[PDB]
């Protein structure tokens with residue numbers, strides 16, 4: 001499979017034709033306020049520098065694989081282990097977030113993928129309700145170089161080639177996310193890539209993370225994808241809510 | 252295992268000492284209203300008179316086995332199939348509901364147990380989030396004979412004996428449940444019996460169903476269990492919420 005052409009994803013995986021797909025356009029006017037939605041809890045995200053992590057250009061994204069012991073809770077009894085994070089982005093003067101807010105697409109988006117602690121493996125959790133949980137944050141232009149992002153973006157040159165990987169020191173993974181863990185939208189959707197299995201709990205932060213213009217250009221301009229194509233515009237079109245209600249942790 | 256004797260539930264299953272157990276005390280004033288909680292959808296519950304259904308005194312409760320094709324949804328893409336229903340009850344001058352409301356114990360309680368259609372087997376669903384869902388309704392004393400409950404209360408004589416079972420005509424399972432499918436409480440907890448597996452979605456109707464004082468005396472006074480004992484007060488003690496917030500489908 002690939003972005004911007006064949007094969008049609010439903011041919012790869014029927015779930016890509018499901019009624020309840022991700023990503024979605026967030027219209028906060030139609031969001032349901034749910035005061036049961038408490039601030040997210042992250043444990044073990046502050047890593048020591050050794051052992052190193054693997055950062056990989058997989059031709060669809062840049063993925064950092066996370067070590068065991070990163071625990072995330074969406075709430076009491078809603079417990080997850082972090083697997084990996086990856087990015088979705090655009091191209092020179094084109095935004096590439098997956099989620100939109102009232103039709104606004106942001107420059108880029110981070111996804112931190114988690115596995116429910118009731119499941120040993122992702123293949124066992126695919127299509128099960130709440131089996132997988134993704135923390136999603138928009139990346140926007142700010143005036144300062146983001147030093148946590150710089151540790152990954154400074155290494156993209158080494159992994160320019162599709163299927164390339166490199167080792168990076170452990171860092172504070174939580175410094176790649178917004179500091180406000182209180183304000184977020186939450187809905188049930190799918191993987192945004194094949195096999196597009198449903199049952200995924202999506203948390204999209206209200207607060208955005210700030211990268212420099214130069215950092216956003218490094219992300220969109222450095223990596224190569226399938227064939228001789230630049231790895232750019234690696235986002236799925238917005239999918240209808242089809243009667244799902246996005247909840248918000250704030251009125 | 253048995254009610255209020257030995258062995259020690261945590262020795263039978265140590266999951267009975269878990270942090271997110273059922274039943275709980277419902278405090279409606281502290282429930283979080285979410286407009287995402289839509290009316291319960293129960294299709295195929297109006298069963299024909301044939302085939303008959305198994306009703307069994309298992310020493311813990313009276314259990315009615317349910318046929319295939321009883322479909323239930325808690326929300327978009329969150330579908331279930333009904334497996335069985337059973338009851339919890341008290342004794343002479345003593346209520347026996349499992350759930351309480353503001354510390355009040357109701358005379359009795361009906362549970363309709365369901366399996367997520369994302370799991371082929373109950374043993375895969377046990378201990379997985381949303382694997383099992385129970386619909387729960389309080390039984391209260393009203394002045395009239397309840398027609399729906401008569402079909403079961405009038406067959407308890409034939410199964411007074413621990414481990415006894417009879418066959419009963421098909422009945423409208425949906426007629427056992429309260430009036431308003433839009434008004435309920437919901438939280439995530441456990442089996443209230445060993446093995447006390449967590450990940451159960453509990454849906455507790457706001458409205459009660461009414462039985463005659465006769466009907467209630469019958470339920471609590473006709474069955475025998477643990478050896479030479481009357482089957483009575485077959486409810487579990489109140490479990491702490493441990494930070495869980497009960498949701499409400501109405502403001």
Ligand SMILES: NS(=O)(=O)c1cc(C(=O)NCCCO)c(Sc2ccccc2)cc1Cl
Nearest residue numbers: 060061063086111113134190191192193194
């Ligand atoms: N965008 S997402 O909904 O958060 C998402 C993306 C990926 C994923 O890594 N896709 C490939 C490109 C990114 O590295 C995976 S897991 C995986 C699935 C198929 C193939 C390989 C891995 C899980 C999720 Cl929930």
Ligand SMILES: NS(=O)(=O)c1cc(C(=O)NCCCO)c(Sc2ccccc2)cc1Cl
Nearest residue numbers: 311312313314337362364373385442443444
């Ligand atoms: N009270 S309850 O949490 O609703 C409950 C009770 C029982 C149970 O039948 N034992 C108690 C008395 C029965 O007549 C089961 S049985 C079962 C079904 C599928 C999987 C595992 C167990 C499941 C549940 Cl959710």
Ligand SMILES: [Zn+2]
Nearest residue numbers: 086088111192
């Ligand atoms: Zn993604």
Ligand SMILES: [Zn+2]
Nearest residue numbers: 337339362443
């Ligand atoms: Zn029960």
